[PDB]
């Protein structure tokens, strides 16, 4: 299905569009600040998921 | 981490 980026709200450029390992949210690596130059190989959690951690 | 492309 069509996930969208939390920052820019577009679902284009699938190749750069990170999925959150904890929910159905997404972010383009090029929209991320700080600079994310590549798709990380480990788990990645969006900011909404960080809010639920302890 | 997986992308929208690697998941679809
Ligand atoms: Zn974006
Ligand atoms: Zn999340």
Residue numbers in the entry:
A (entry chain A): 1675 to 1728
B (entry chain G): 1 to 8
List sentences from the manuscript:
The plant homeodomain (PHD) finger is one of the largest families of epigenetic reader domains present in chromatin-related proteins, with over 170 PHD fingers identified in the human genome. BAZ2A binds to the ATPase SNF2h (sucrose nonfermenting protein 2 homolog) to form the chromatin remodeling complex NoRC (nucleolar remodeling complex), which plays an essential role in silencing ribosomal DNA (rDNA) genes.
The peptide residues A1-K4 form an antiparallel β-sheet with the first β-strand of BAZ2A PHD, anchored by backbone hydrogen bonds with residues D1688, L1692, L1693, P1714 and G1716. The canonical intrapeptide i to i + 4 backbone hydrogen bonds stabilize the helix loop i.e. T3 to A7 and K4 to R8. Two additional side chain-to-backbone intramolecular hydrogen bonds are formed, one between the T3 hydroxyl group and the amino group of T6, and a second one between the hydroxyl group of T6 and the amino group of R2. There is no interpretable density for K9 and S10, suggesting that these are disordered. Conversely, crystal packing occludes the binding sites of chains B and C and no peptide is found bound to these protomers. However strikingly, the structure shows no direct interactions between residues T6-S10 and the protein, besides a potential long-range hydrophobic contact between the A7 methyl group and the L1693 side chain.
